[PDB]
Amino acid sequence: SLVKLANTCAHLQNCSKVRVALTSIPYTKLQLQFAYNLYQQGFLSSLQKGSTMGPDKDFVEVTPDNISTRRLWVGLKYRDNKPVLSSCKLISKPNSRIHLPMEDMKKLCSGVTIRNIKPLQPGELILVRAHNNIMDINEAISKKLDGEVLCRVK
Amino acid sequence: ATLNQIKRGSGPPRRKKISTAPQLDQCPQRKGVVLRVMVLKPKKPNSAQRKACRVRLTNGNVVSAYIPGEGHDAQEHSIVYVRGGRCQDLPGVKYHVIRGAGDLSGVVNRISSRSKYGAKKPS
Amino acid sequence: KEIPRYENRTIYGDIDFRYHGVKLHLRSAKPGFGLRVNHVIFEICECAGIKDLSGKVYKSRNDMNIAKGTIEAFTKAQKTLDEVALGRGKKLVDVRKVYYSS
Amino acid sequence: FSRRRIAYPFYPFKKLGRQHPKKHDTNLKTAMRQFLGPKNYKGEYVMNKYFTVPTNHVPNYIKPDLERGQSLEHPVTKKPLQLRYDGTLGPPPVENKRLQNIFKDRLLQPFPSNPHCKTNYVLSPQLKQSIFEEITVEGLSAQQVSQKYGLKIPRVEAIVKLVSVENSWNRRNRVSSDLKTMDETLYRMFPVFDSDASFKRENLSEIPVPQKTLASRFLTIAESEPFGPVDAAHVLELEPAVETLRNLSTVGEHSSGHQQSTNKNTKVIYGELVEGERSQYKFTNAKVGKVGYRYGSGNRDNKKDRRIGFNKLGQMVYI
RNA sequence: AAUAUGAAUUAAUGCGAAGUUGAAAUACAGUUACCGUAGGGGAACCUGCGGUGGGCUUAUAAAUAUCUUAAAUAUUCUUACA
RNA sequence: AAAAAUAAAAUCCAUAAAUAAUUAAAAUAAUGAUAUUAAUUACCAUAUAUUUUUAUAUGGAUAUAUUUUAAUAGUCCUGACUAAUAUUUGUGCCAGCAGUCGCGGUAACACAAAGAGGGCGAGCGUUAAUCAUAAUGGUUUAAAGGAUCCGUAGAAUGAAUUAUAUAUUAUAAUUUAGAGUUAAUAAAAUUAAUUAAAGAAUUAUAAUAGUAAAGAUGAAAUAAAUAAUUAUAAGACUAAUAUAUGUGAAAAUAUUAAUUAAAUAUUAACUGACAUUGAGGGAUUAAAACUAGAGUAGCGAAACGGAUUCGAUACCCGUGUAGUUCUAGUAGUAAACUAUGAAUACAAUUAUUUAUAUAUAUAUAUAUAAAUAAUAAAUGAAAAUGAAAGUAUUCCACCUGAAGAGUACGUUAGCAAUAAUGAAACUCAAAACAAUAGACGG
RNA sequence: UAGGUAGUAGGUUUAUUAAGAGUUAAACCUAGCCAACGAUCCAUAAUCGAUAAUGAAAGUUAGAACGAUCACGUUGACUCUGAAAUAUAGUCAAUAUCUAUAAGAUACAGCAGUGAGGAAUAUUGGACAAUGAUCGAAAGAUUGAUCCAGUUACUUAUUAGGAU
Ligand SMILES: [K+]
Ligand SMILES: [K+]
Ligand SMILES: [K+]
Ligand SMILES: [K+]
Ligand SMILES: [K+]
Ligand SMILES: [K+]
Ligand SMILES: [K+]
Ligand SMILES: [K+]
Ligand SMILES: [K+]
Ligand SMILES: [K+]
Ligand SMILES: [K+]
Ligand SMILES: [K+]
Ligand SMILES: [K+]
Ligand SMILES: [Mg+2]
Ligand SMILES: [Mg+2]
Ligand SMILES: [Mg+2]
Ligand SMILES: [Mg+2]
Ligand SMILES: [Mg+2]
Ligand SMILES: [Mg+2]
Ligand SMILES: [Mg+2]
Ligand SMILES: [Mg+2]
Ligand SMILES: [Mg+2]
Ligand SMILES: [Mg+2]
Ligand SMILES: [Mg+2]
Ligand SMILES: [Mg+2]
Ligand SMILES: [Mg+2]
Ligand SMILES: [Mg+2]
Ligand SMILES: [Mg+2]
Ligand SMILES: [Mg+2]
Ligand SMILES: [Mg+2]
Ligand SMILES: [Mg+2]
Ligand SMILES: [Mg+2]
Ligand SMILES: [Mg+2]
Ligand SMILES: [Mg+2]
Ligand SMILES: [Mg+2]
Ligand SMILES: [Mg+2]
Ligand SMILES: [Mg+2]
Ligand SMILES: [Mg+2]
Ligand SMILES: [Mg+2]
Ligand SMILES: [Mg+2]
Ligand SMILES: [Mg+2]
Ligand SMILES: [Mg+2]
Ligand SMILES: [Mg+2]
Ligand SMILES: [Mg+2]
Ligand SMILES: [Mg+2]
Ligand SMILES: [Mg+2]
Ligand SMILES: [Mg+2]
Ligand SMILES: [Mg+2]
Ligand SMILES: [Mg+2]
Ligand SMILES: [Mg+2]
Ligand SMILES: [Mg+2]
Ligand SMILES: [Mg+2]
Ligand SMILES: [Mg+2]
Ligand SMILES: [Mg+2]
Ligand SMILES: [Mg+2]
Ligand SMILES: [Mg+2]
Ligand SMILES: [Mg+2]
Ligand SMILES: [Mg+2]
Ligand SMILES: [Mg+2]
Ligand SMILES: [Mg+2]
Ligand SMILES: [Mg+2]
Ligand SMILES: [Mg+2]
Ligand SMILES: [Mg+2]
Ligand SMILES: [Mg+2]
Ligand SMILES: [Mg+2]
Ligand SMILES: [Mg+2]
Ligand SMILES: [Mg+2]
């Protein structure tokens, strides 16, 4: 769901403004892939599976009995009195989805505004979804993949 | 507006200057015949005896044109050429007559800006 | 105040900053691009040492609030490559600069 | 705020006082006569320090800021002379310290307000012959002579071309005394090039700056990932910069690597020539869809950007 | 039947200058104003009915207070005592 | 530092044109309209050397030299926007200028000129036009949230897992977090419609004794009483509680009872995305008004009188008709307001109530929600908003300077009043909001 | 402009055509078809480009010039020939003019030119030398296509004197 992803993007911005060290997001494949990309890129300190009440200390298998109570817990980073994850916005919106070929993704990473999408800025992360997998735009260009431009994180 | 409202027509209004000489019919100038020469009083805070003239254009539109320059020889039945441009202090006078065209002579003894007053170059 | 400058000529990336009623959209520019911005922003860039910059002002174009907004944007809306790298634990490479390196 | 401003000298000068009614002089004209000094019966300005050319390979460029408008000196002793109350020229009261230790860069800077403009070094008549004899007789490559004397390859190729023109002129006695006099005078006005002097040597690593690369792309990679010039070149989809420099050094007509044969693959026919025919037909194979004048092409003749060229005879022709 | 033109005839409104008759609004504007509606009157306006605050949140006391070693002891103390 | 001005003349050296010779190319088998061709050469031809080019020397050709020879730009502008500092004269709100702001009433940087100056330039100016010049927007208070909700279309949007496919979509299976169904347990007595009752007072009438004034107002005057104690009749209204708290989609809703309908929390089970929003459409909708039939105490447009007043078609007083009431309808408008559409996810505190649950050393304590108040952050033109007017997402309505105008015309609906829909021309460079310091206030 | 449509929507059959189809004509059935994502109606307009203008761009504007396409040759309809024409043909009619007064000829939106209209747009020029086109076996003939020149600062470009 792009709506759920929009909710998570706004939630992370709200948490950064108040500078909470730990927060939770919905437990879904897309959310987990989204969070994992942020973790590998250094935007998130930690990524743990858990419940509504907090991160799990020991592995708890997820089943239909507890799926409704599952959450993903992420740790936010702050350095030099500044949040590492300052902004998080969707590019492809629920009511206007944007699919780009690899050629247009290369233009976006080169400073060209494609379909009103402002080009990639220094130190910014743009994520792309292709065949239900989320990857960095630079990685999609390396794999010659065409996909939906989901969001941009800075 | 929402994305669907924009799809249905919603959008920013367009900015483009509007015509201030509708009676000319998108022509640089139109010939006319002076119906009656008149003197009008500027709107406040201006005071003067501004010379104007009612003119019937070759397209049937009747307009009020300001006669520029010091002194004019325009009379009734005189053939005049009317161009765009309003007299700011005279409401309803939206046009100018061209000096030195038709039966309206150039300003007598004009030295500066002669081209604007139909004055030929002194030898 | 000190303002970060990328290569001591321009800003780091693009800036969309709102100072009261003034909407400032500043974009970084290539070397030799010059200053193509509001006249108020031009003077500030000259004193600050910014040589290449593009941008547009939207909504309010009040000179006083443009100057203050610009100064605030140059400090609160910029992040150096070094600061981004340290916060994220990643290496950020300027491809254009590496292309002309040994 | 702006107003018209007469270009009065920035330095102090003796303004006009009470003037006889028929002089009709100006403060600008009197300031110029003070800069120029007295004019002799021969129409010369001997007292001005710029009237005569230097003869020591050191350019005599104007330094108004450092001398504060004092341009007069003794024509033989080169000792400063300034205007006094009597209306005569005499030694200055205090020496000018700004004119005794001038930076080396400033000496080569002709315009006071532009320090990015410098004069070039003149090559001695000997270095030119050496370069000419090495490229032509010894058969060295322009790349070698360029890397040896610290001269850019285009300059090396130009020296060979020009020295060849000087040999034909000297072989036909076309270099007159006046030309020799002028050449020597101009030679003694410029700093001579010294191949050994490191600072005088021209940079040999310059490449044209492309436009696609002029943008600033940034990549976020792992903290310990190596990224080098070759990796950057792949990202920008350009040949490595070192390769560009090497390809630009093999362009000289006498440089190594100069090659042009991949184009000799276009079928050409030279029509038969019969006695009495004033011209020969040459046919060049082409491909339908590329050859021909296109239909409906933009006419630019009535536009400011109308294309203007020059034919083989040098006559201006519309393209 | 439509379109266009002129048209007897007839309705609404803008601006321009000063005057005339009142003083309706802005302060508690001298009867709180305004909204919907109805009736009445030279003119603004007046009156009835409900609604609104873009008017009253502008809001500010019937007061009453207690016992343990006043010092040879607390109050001093300068890295000390322990 | 007031220049005009290296400007002029003059000096040096050129080229164009002319003159002379020569002469391509468009076209060749030949044909050239253009054409008095372009170009080249400067006595012509020739030889040699000679990037080019140059140079020498030769044949003929004139008197040691060899055809001639120049250089007259206009137009707008100089108060600011907007480049134009060297001043001066005339005019005096006249004459006139003007793209915008404006200039002109005797020191006019703006009019008409001189001087000087700034542009563009064989064009310059001006008019008529085109493109660009802010939606990288808004709707509490400035233009702009529909009275409200229900719900159709939506070529609108919308959960989870897995597997395929031709892939952000489809299909299949599976799942329960959204949305619902039914019970159980506890809680509450409101909101609609209908029926049946109660209450204080008012007016009128009659009686009774008892009198001579009463009533009204700022003060007045107009129209066996007033007051008191009884009895009868009628219509309308609903004191305290009470906070409209709460409830209801809004409009609305507070004397009592009953009948019917709907409405809360948690738990258990069940369905398995069945949801959100909603053009058109539909329903409901204060007060006034209207159509019929009743009712009519009090109140009260109008009307007629009394006062007040310079006047009083008002404010105050009297008599008081419609109306206000009920029954059945029409109509669908309000400052129908929180001047703030609905839904979802999310973000830092305190206080105060309410509800549910838990515990006990039994009355507090501990939890989780809702409401309200004051706030942090954020937002904003600010006033302020504060869980939204914050961070985001989805859908709908609406706005594009003022005035003209919610007007004109047409159409639709209505018994009618009217309601809905809804312009343009002309004119202007205004118009509006928040806040600041004043001044003023019967 | 809110309802429109009645060969109208669909089915079947024949005629007609090289050829499908309510495309036309004939017959018989079904009750459909379009429409608030704008039907029907009315007004306006030749369309477009690798053309021109403008802008950072998306776009917007023009549709003169170059090129592509359509329509028309005073107006309407019809017919003939033909692969193809409601032909700048023929027929009839309409409007206007003309002379030869005939069931007549002409219609400059071919070139030049004139009057009119308008603020405003040119020579009643030269040549078939070139490139094409038509006729002819060829020789050649014809060509206001075309190529040139004239008029006009309408646009562009170059030049319109340098040193002292
Ligand atoms: K009033
Ligand atoms: K009212
Ligand atoms: K009223
Ligand atoms: K000039
Ligand atoms: K607002
Ligand atoms: K309430
Ligand atoms: K399912
Ligand atoms: K729906
Ligand atoms: K609706
Ligand atoms: K009554
Ligand atoms: K809505
Ligand atoms: K239509
Ligand atoms: K021909
Ligand atoms: Mg200026
Ligand atoms: Mg009054
Ligand atoms: Mg009043
Ligand atoms: Mg009042
Ligand atoms: Mg009344
Ligand atoms: Mg009232
Ligand atoms: Mg008030
Ligand atoms: Mg208040
Ligand atoms: Mg010549
Ligand atoms: Mg021929
Ligand atoms: Mg020939
Ligand atoms: Mg003028
Ligand atoms: Mg004066
Ligand atoms: Mg001016
Ligand atoms: Mg003037
Ligand atoms: Mg002058
Ligand atoms: Mg020109
Ligand atoms: Mg735009
Ligand atoms: Mg809103
Ligand atoms: Mg509302
Ligand atoms: Mg409203
Ligand atoms: Mg549930
Ligand atoms: Mg009584
Ligand atoms: Mg009560
Ligand atoms: Mg409440
Ligand atoms: Mg709904
Ligand atoms: Mg009420
Ligand atoms: Mg009745
Ligand atoms: Mg009365
Ligand atoms: Mg009276
Ligand atoms: Mg009364
Ligand atoms: Mg009703
Ligand atoms: Mg109304
Ligand atoms: Mg309304
Ligand atoms: Mg209300
Ligand atoms: Mg709901
Ligand atoms: Mg109405
Ligand atoms: Mg205000
Ligand atoms: Mg049909
Ligand atoms: Mg058929
Ligand atoms: Mg039939
Ligand atoms: Mg047409
Ligand atoms: Mg177009
Ligand atoms: Mg068009
Ligand atoms: Mg044409
Ligand atoms: Mg035809
Ligand atoms: Mg026809
Ligand atoms: Mg015909
Ligand atoms: Mg004709
Ligand atoms: Mg013609
Ligand atoms: Mg005419
Ligand atoms: Mg023309
Ligand atoms: Mg002519
Ligand atoms: Mg001919």
PDB file of N, CA and C (backbone and C1' of nucleotides) and ligand atoms in Angstrom, chain E residues 51-52, chain F residues 250-252 334-338, ligand 48:
ATOM      1  P     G E  51     -33.836  33.108  18.522  1.00  0.00           P
ATOM      2  O5'   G E  51     -32.668  33.130  17.441  1.00  0.00           O
ATOM      3  C5'   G E  51     -32.446  32.018  16.589  1.00  0.00           C
ATOM      4  C4'   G E  51     -31.482  32.351  15.480  1.00  0.00           C
ATOM      5  C3'   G E  51     -30.147  32.932  15.911  1.00  0.00           C
ATOM      6  O3'   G E  51     -29.232  31.936  16.335  1.00  0.00           O
ATOM      7  C1'   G E  51     -31.027  34.211  14.127  1.00  0.00           C
ATOM      8  P     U E  52     -28.203  32.224  17.532  1.00  0.00           P
ATOM      9  O5'   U E  52     -27.067  33.113  16.860  1.00  0.00           O
ATOM     10  C5'   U E  52     -26.328  32.631  15.748  1.00  0.00           C
ATOM     11  C4'   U E  52     -25.448  33.703  15.159  1.00  0.00           C
ATOM     12  C3'   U E  52     -24.580  34.469  16.145  1.00  0.00           C
ATOM     13  O3'   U E  52     -23.397  33.769  16.493  1.00  0.00           O
ATOM     14  C1'   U E  52     -25.651  35.991  14.688  1.00  0.00           C
TER      15        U E  52
ATOM     16  P     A F 250     -25.817  17.165  14.200  1.00  0.00           P
ATOM     17  O5'   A F 250     -26.401  18.462  13.483  1.00  0.00           O
ATOM     18  C5'   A F 250     -25.548  19.372  12.806  1.00  0.00           C
ATOM     19  C4'   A F 250     -26.306  20.187  11.789  1.00  0.00           C
ATOM     20  C3'   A F 250     -27.417  21.074  12.334  1.00  0.00           C
ATOM     21  O3'   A F 250     -26.946  22.299  12.868  1.00  0.00           O
ATOM     22  C1'   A F 250     -28.232  19.859  10.489  1.00  0.00           C
ATOM     23  P     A F 251     -27.770  23.041  14.029  1.00  0.00           P
ATOM     24  O5'   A F 251     -29.201  23.308  13.385  1.00  0.00           O
ATOM     25  C5'   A F 251     -29.370  24.259  12.344  1.00  0.00           C
ATOM     26  C4'   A F 251     -30.780  24.254  11.810  1.00  0.00           C
ATOM     27  C3'   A F 251     -31.880  24.489  12.834  1.00  0.00           C
ATOM     28  O3'   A F 251     -32.071  25.857  13.147  1.00  0.00           O
ATOM     29  C1'   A F 251     -32.444  22.629  11.498  1.00  0.00           C
ATOM     30  P     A F 252     -32.614  26.274  14.597  1.00  0.00           P
ATOM     31  O5'   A F 252     -33.888  25.345  14.801  1.00  0.00           O
ATOM     32  C5'   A F 252     -34.310  24.953  16.097  1.00  0.00           C
ATOM     33  C4'   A F 252     -34.564  23.469  16.169  1.00  0.00           C
ATOM     34  C3'   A F 252     -34.893  22.923  17.549  1.00  0.00           C
ATOM     35  O3'   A F 252     -36.257  23.091  17.892  1.00  0.00           O
ATOM     36  C1'   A F 252     -33.236  21.571  16.543  1.00  0.00           C
ATOM     37  P     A F 334     -29.982  32.399   1.639  1.00  0.00           P
ATOM     38  O5'   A F 334     -30.295  32.631   3.181  1.00  0.00           O
ATOM     39  C5'   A F 334     -29.309  32.369   4.167  1.00  0.00           C
ATOM     40  C4'   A F 334     -29.604  33.086   5.458  1.00  0.00           C
ATOM     41  C3'   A F 334     -28.658  32.774   6.605  1.00  0.00           C
ATOM     42  O3'   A F 334     -27.458  33.524   6.542  1.00  0.00           O
ATOM     43  C1'   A F 334     -30.897  32.654   7.366  1.00  0.00           C
ATOM     44  P     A F 335     -26.159  32.921   5.815  1.00  0.00           P
ATOM     45  O5'   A F 335     -25.013  33.068   6.904  1.00  0.00           O
ATOM     46  C5'   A F 335     -24.715  34.331   7.488  1.00  0.00           C
ATOM     47  C4'   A F 335     -24.549  34.215   8.981  1.00  0.00           C
ATOM     48  C3'   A F 335     -25.848  34.167   9.781  1.00  0.00           C
ATOM     49  O3'   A F 335     -25.688  33.292  10.896  1.00  0.00           O
ATOM     50  C1'   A F 335     -24.542  35.985  10.515  1.00  0.00           C
ATOM     51  P     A F 336     -26.829  32.225  11.263  1.00  0.00           P
ATOM     52  O5'   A F 336     -27.257  31.606   9.858  1.00  0.00           O
ATOM     53  C5'   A F 336     -26.502  30.569   9.252  1.00  0.00           C
ATOM     54  C4'   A F 336     -27.177  29.230   9.412  1.00  0.00           C
ATOM     55  C3'   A F 336     -26.443  28.042   8.816  1.00  0.00           C
ATOM     56  O3'   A F 336     -25.415  27.557   9.663  1.00  0.00           O
ATOM     57  C1'   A F 336     -28.722  27.958   8.190  1.00  0.00           C
ATOM     58  P     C F 337     -23.991  27.127   9.058  1.00  0.00           P
ATOM     59  O5'   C F 337     -22.940  27.887   9.982  1.00  0.00           O
ATOM     60  C5'   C F 337     -22.041  27.173  10.823  1.00  0.00           C
ATOM     61  C4'   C F 337     -21.544  28.030  11.961  1.00  0.00           C
ATOM     62  C3'   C F 337     -22.630  28.563  12.894  1.00  0.00           C
ATOM     63  O3'   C F 337     -22.107  28.689  14.216  1.00  0.00           O
ATOM     64  C1'   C F 337     -21.500  30.374  11.907  1.00  0.00           C
ATOM     65  P     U F 338     -21.901  27.392  15.141  1.00  0.00           P
ATOM     66  O5'   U F 338     -20.333  27.355  15.415  1.00  0.00           O
ATOM     67  C5'   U F 338     -19.716  28.291  16.296  1.00  0.00           C
ATOM     68  C4'   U F 338     -18.240  28.441  16.012  1.00  0.00           C
ATOM     69  C3'   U F 338     -17.900  29.046  14.650  1.00  0.00           C
ATOM     70  O3'   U F 338     -16.689  29.798  14.742  1.00  0.00           O
ATOM     71  C1'   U F 338     -16.986  26.883  14.788  1.00  0.00           C
TER      72        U F 338
HETATM   73 MG    MG H  48     -28.393  28.286  14.527  1.00  0.00          MG
END
